[PDB]
Design a protein around this nucleic acid. Structure first.
Lengths: 53, 82, 145, 100, 141, 167, 143, 103, 63
RNA sequence: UUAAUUGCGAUAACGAACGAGACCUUAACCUACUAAAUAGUGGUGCUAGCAUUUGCUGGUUAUCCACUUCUUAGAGGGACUAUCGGUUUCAAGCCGAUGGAAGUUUGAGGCAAUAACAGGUCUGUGAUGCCCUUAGACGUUCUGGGCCGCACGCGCGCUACACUGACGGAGCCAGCGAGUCUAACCUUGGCCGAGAGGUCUUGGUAAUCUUGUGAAACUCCGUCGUGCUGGGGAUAGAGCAUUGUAAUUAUUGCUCUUCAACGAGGAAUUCCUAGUAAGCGCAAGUCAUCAGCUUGCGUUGAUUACGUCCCUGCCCUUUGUACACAC
């Protein structure tokens, strides 16, 4: 019961997970969007982030 | 095992740094006839210590024999008044 | 500008606790030749002894050094705040100390041997000669044995 | 009341028209107010690798989001301010009012 | 009612704004006299105008300069451009255009940057290298 | 609560979330895109769909449950989310609608060549300057290949692609 | 002729004011100086043992005069430098705050510097009034 | 302080005295045959004349008592007067000498 | 480089072939009428056409 | 003629499409419906110096008064080979002369075709067939270990081998940028405290708070003077702190001892044509404090630019081929 998830994940690398695919790598924590670098590339257009230079 | 060195020789420099009467009166009688006097000029001609060169230079300008023209650090340019 | 008469009393070498200490150089940087006292420690011991910092190792009287050595031997006696010393709270005693020219190696051997005798990770590493402060041994340290 | 309506949109054309018709609609009421204050643009830069894996030349694409914030100072009664702001609402633009 | 003119000079990222009026022949930078920066290399740089056309145009004109941005040498460049424009703009509005077009001709001949702000803005850095054009290193085996 | 910088970047995710959410259930409904209208204590979410009667359902059955999904997804106060659906003209001018149409035709069992020829022919009549379709993968071979369909004149480079081209 | 502060040199002022403070002997330094690093990035203490604090007080006094409000952390940044982390590349490092803090309360203690609103220090009336005797040597000699 | 004539003239006389009048360029030939002597433009002269004076000074003040200011002077003193011992002058005629042999 | 493309060369040629008495040798007075005579979507493009129109005008002036 | 299948033009081709260009982003003169005292303010109120004659800085908070030329960027704007000088079937166009925030398309970047690669990624994906798979498993986790292990070789890197330099003062000057709900992140000042962080938070829908970025580099004056020296925490030992239900294989920062290799580094090799290179450092990504990496940047600011194809590779054409995934 208490040991099922006893080891903390409130800090470090296990706390953050991609809000689209739950991955823990290549995350964009800046501005609090928390999408992986792979998925942000597809979602950059509709999130408002556009290429200019 | 190889250490990739050259290890050239040395000249065994003997810059004296505490000066006695023999050096003190030698520089006093030789500060004339020197068109350009500096820290490196003193040590490369009268073989005195590096700090002695700048301290002696301050002594020669305190009483005043060699008239400085440029008082910059890292390069002291003193001439002798005539 | 200040000039002095140089006599034969100049000592080209100094004898401090069976170690050759150079003359004709700054007293602060001459004392660094002693194992255990360096640029800062010589600065402090010379401040406590009230010796003119501009003077060399040539014109120093025997009394001027006898206080310098006394400070080196017993720093805690002169009310030192116990953060300059190289050996604070020794494992063997717990009291503030400061290592000497020959004591620094003796205690370094003593503090290395206690790790060896207890077979700690650090002690087996010093016995091995490998890096003990976590440095990777994969890349650095090939031409050392 | 010393109201300060604020505008924090990203599309400049949407900001510029809605601010233009906020001044002319407030001036048509013959009320006092200040002209728009153009704050510096706030570009938000997300610099990321282009590749999904870790193979290839190190190529990076830098996405930018432009944020344009504008405030206009007005002193108008609320019983007309409420009917001033909510009308000509524009999609994408963010027109909001504050109290004190 | 006091005859004044506010002008600007620019550098790589430095900018000096000059307030030029009909005063007492004083020149000041950043609340301090321009004559006491004294690094003995750039003293002549801010002195170049008054050194080449004299003080005949500096008798009854007070100039105060506020420079910001950039570095030491950049700020000095901006300072020279600010005081240069101020004298140009001062004789543009109040003194004869003959005085202004002759001082511009001497200032241009001595140094174009006495009138033109240097158009050499920095180049942004690109990826794959340490700088704008330099690369990291090409390894082959 | 949140700085206007980070609030706006969170708006795009709220749209990016809504755009992805509305592409899965409403697939058979010909969903094209969504637009979000933000109002003080109100949010208008407009759906451009091919089949309004399907997205509406009986007595609004198919328009109210999705309104509840978005409401309970982001935990707003009840009654502050309003869901509207409209018939979107120019079905051929929306690449999303055409791409799903080919997807559903492929899942039905229709040959890839005829389905791709149908869509470019349909986009032809819709008033498009040009259209392009690529079907990449296993096509009559265990080895993948990406064979293409197009007509008219397209554009590949420059800013006009960002506006005059829908992908 | 007219008297003003900034119309004199900056390099000779700092030294001359420090000698003024040293000669007067009223700064009221507790005495624990010549012990601390004076900056965590500075690995050696000042060479000017008998001074280094009359100048620092002279340095801050001119600094607070030209500024309006300054803080302990701000002056640590102003007097800080780069720490040589050996092989690691250089980084800016702030100075110890005690030296800067106790050099300002010393200025408070003797009357040079008064506390200011919105936090910080300020050039005081007594601090400015003693600059006339400071600039007297400069003006008398050159004119 | 030395050479009581105009100080600037010495520098320009130094530069005008160490500009190599002719040097030799690399020619491939049939794998390796020779080097060919070619004339030097006045702009190339000044480029080399400035360089040799500045190279000599940096290499002379390195690891010695002499400051970069005083040793850069002593290279210009000998370059302007002509001593065949200054770093710039020795290299100038050495390059000229080798160009003469490899005409 | 300095060479210009067909999109400004044929546009300039077409204008001269049709609007000859309305334009003249000067670039500045040709810019004002080129942007109102022909719908040009770019400031840079309209500048190029007006420059190639006055260029051919100088050539037409002599033979 | 091309930093252009760019155009001028012979023309069995004509008319087109894609690519290039055009397009989009920055610096910066509109001084009039682009500014709040969120920036010098033009006159408030007085205090600290001298001249009773004419300055050098601080400022309560909705009286303002003919308010906007600097980091702020819309509407006719602006730079198109101006014009001119010469060279070319005067044809598109090399090159020079004053000019203007700038002239080989202004600088730089984004976007960027048609084939292809068994290129890389099944370890981003809740995007996907097979695996003695559905109550001892590769699934799901919990504790302890570990690319955090050393005979060795290689790649990207950091700091040095010092007087143009180390250290001690002192003077201080940028630009990108970030920072707050089931919040103690952004160390502002009044925590005595004193590297670090517990006290309090008086603090802006982040120009008035960190930060008028108030920083490293740099730069008057002094300390050693050419030595394996003050170029030395590279490597050990001893201690002091904060993030972390937890660091022993230094988390990281701080104070103290000794010189260790290293003395313009072999063959070889990389990058580079302007405010570039190079020196320097800062913000962001990562981040539980603190990263020798990256991305951006900004400070100080070098030798030729009339280049060549022999210097390894591209583009086009002609030619030979016994080659054909093709030397």
């Amino acid at each position: 019961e208490n040991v099922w998830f006893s080891h903390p994940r409130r800090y470090g690398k296990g706390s953050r997970q991609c809000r689209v695919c739950s991955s823990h790598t290549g995350l964009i924590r800046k501005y609090g969007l928390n999408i992986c670098r792979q998925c942000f590339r597809e979602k950059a257009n509709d999130i408002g982030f556009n290429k200019f230079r | 095992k190889k250490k990739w060195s050259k290890k050239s020789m040395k000249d065994r420099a003997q810059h004296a740094v505490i000066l006695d009467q023999e050096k003190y009166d030698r520089i006093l009688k030789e500060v004339p006839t020197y068109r350009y006097v500096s820290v490196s000029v003193l040590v490369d001609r009268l073989k005195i210590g590096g700090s002695l060169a700048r301290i002696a230079l301050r002594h020669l300008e305190k009483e005043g024999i060699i008239k400085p023209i440029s008082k910059h650090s890292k390069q002291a340019i003193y001439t002798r008044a005539t | 500008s200040l000039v002095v008469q140089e006599q034969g009393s100049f000592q080209h070498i100094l004898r401090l606790l069976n170690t050759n200490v150079d003359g004709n150089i700054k007293i602060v940087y001459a004392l660094t030749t002693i194992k255990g006292v360096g640029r800062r420690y010589s600065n402090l011991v010379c401040k406590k002894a009230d010796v003119d910092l501009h003077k060399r190792a040539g014109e120093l009287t025997q009394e001027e050094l006898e206080r310098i050595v006394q400070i080196m031997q017993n720093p805690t006696h002169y009310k030192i705040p116990a953060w300059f010393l190289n050996r604070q709270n020794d494992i063997t005693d717990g009291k503030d100390y400061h290592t000497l020219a020959n004591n620094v190696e003796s205690k370094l051997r003593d503090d290395l041997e206690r790790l060896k005798k207890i077979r700690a990770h650090r002690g087996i590493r010093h016995f091995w000669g490998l890096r003990v402060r976590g440095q990777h041994t994969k890349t650095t340290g090939r031409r050392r044995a | 009341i010393k109201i300060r309506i604020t505008l924090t949109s990203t599309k400049v054309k949407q900001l510029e028209n809605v601010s233009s018709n906020i001044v002319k609609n407030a001036e048509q009421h013959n009320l006092v107010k200040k002209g728009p204050v153009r704050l510096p643009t706030k570009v938000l830069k997300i610099s990321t690798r282009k590749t999904p894996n870790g193979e290839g030349s190190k190529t990076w694409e830098t996405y930018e989001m432009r944020i344009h914030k504008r405030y206009i100072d007005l002193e108008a009664p609320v019983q007309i301010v409420k009917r001033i702001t909510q009308i000509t609402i524009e999609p994408g633009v963010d027109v909001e009012v504050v109290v004190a | 009612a006091v005859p004044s003119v506010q002008t600007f000079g620019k550098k790589k990222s430095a900018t000096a704004v000059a307030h030029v009026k009909a005063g007492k022949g004083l020149i000041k930078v950043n609340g301090s006299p321009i004559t006491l920066v004294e690094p003995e290399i750039l003293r002549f740089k801010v002195y170049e105008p008054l050194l080449l056309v004299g003080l005949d145009k500096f008798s009854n004109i007070d100039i105060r300069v506020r420079v910001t941005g950039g570095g030491h040498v950049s700020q000095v460049y901006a300072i020279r451009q600010a005081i240069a424009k101020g004298l140009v703009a001062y004789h543009q509005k109040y003194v004869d255009e003959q005085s202004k077009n002759e001082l511009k001709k001497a200032f241009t001949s001595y140094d174009r940057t006495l009138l033109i702000a240097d158009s050499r803005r920095p180049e942004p850095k690109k990826f794959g290298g340490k700088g704008a054009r330099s690369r990291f290193q090409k390894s082959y085996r | 609560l949140i700085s206007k910088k980070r609030k706006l970047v969170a708006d795009g995710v709220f749209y990016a979330e809504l755009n992805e959410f509305f592409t899965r259930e409403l697939a058979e409904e010909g969903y094209s895109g969504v637009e979000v209208r933000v109002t003080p204590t109100k949010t208008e979410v407009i759906i451009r769909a091919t089949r309004t009667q399907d997205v509406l359902g009986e007595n609004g059955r198919r328009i109210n449950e999705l309104t509840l999904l978005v409401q309970k997804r982001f935990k707003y106060a009840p009654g502050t989310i309003v869901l509207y659906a409209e018939r979107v003209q120019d079905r051929g001018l929306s690449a999303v609608a055409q791409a799903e149409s080919m997807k559903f035709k492929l899942l039905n069992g229709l040959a890839i060549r005829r389905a791709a020829y149908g869509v470019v022919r349909y986009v032809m009549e819709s008033g498009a300057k040009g259209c392009e379709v690529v079907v990449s993968g296993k096509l009559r071979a265990a080895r993948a290949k990406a064979m293409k369909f197009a007509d008219g004149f397209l554009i590949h480079s420059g800013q006009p692609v960002n506006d005059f081209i829908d992908t | 002729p007219g008297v003003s502060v900034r119309d004199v040199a900056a390099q000779d002022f700092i030294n001359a004011y420090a000698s003024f403070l040293q000669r007067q002997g009223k700064l009221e330094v507790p005495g624990y100086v010549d012990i601390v690093k004076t900056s965590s990035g500075n690995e050696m203490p000042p060479q000017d043992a008998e001074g280094w604090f009359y100048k620092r007080a002279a340095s801050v006094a001119r600094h607070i005069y030209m500024r309006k409000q300054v803080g302990v952390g701000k002056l640590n940044k102003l007097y800080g430098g780069a720490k040589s982390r050996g092989v690691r590349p250089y980084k800016h490092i702030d100075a110890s705050g005690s030296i800067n803090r106790k050099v300002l309360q010393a200025l408070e203690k003797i009357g040079i510097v008064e506390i200011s609103p919105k936090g910080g220090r300020r050039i005081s009336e007594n601090g400015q009034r003693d600059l006339d005797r400071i600039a007297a040597q400069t003006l008398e000699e050159d004119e | 302080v030395l050479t009581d004539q105009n100080p600037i003239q010495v520098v320009v006389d130094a530069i005008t005295n160490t500009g190599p009048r002719e040097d030799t360029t690399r020619v491939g030939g049939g794998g390796a045959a020779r080097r060919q002597a070619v004339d030097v433009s006045p702009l190339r002269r000044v480029n080399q004349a400035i360089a040799l004076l500045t190279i000599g000074a940096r290499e002379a003040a390195f690891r010695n008592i002499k400051t970069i200011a005083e040793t850069l002077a002593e290279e210009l003193i000998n370059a302007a007067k002509g001593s065949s011992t200054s770093y710039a002058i020795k290299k100038k005629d050495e390059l000229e000498r080798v160009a003469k042999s490899n005409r | 480089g300095r060479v210009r493309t067909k999109t400004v060369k044929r546009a300039s040629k077409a204008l001269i072939e049709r609007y000859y008495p309305k334009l003249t040798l000067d670039f500045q007075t040709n810019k004002r009428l080129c942007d109102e005579i022909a719908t040009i979507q770019s400031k840079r493009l309209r500048n190029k056409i007006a420059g190639y129109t006055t260029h051919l005008m100088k050539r037409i002036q002599k033979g």
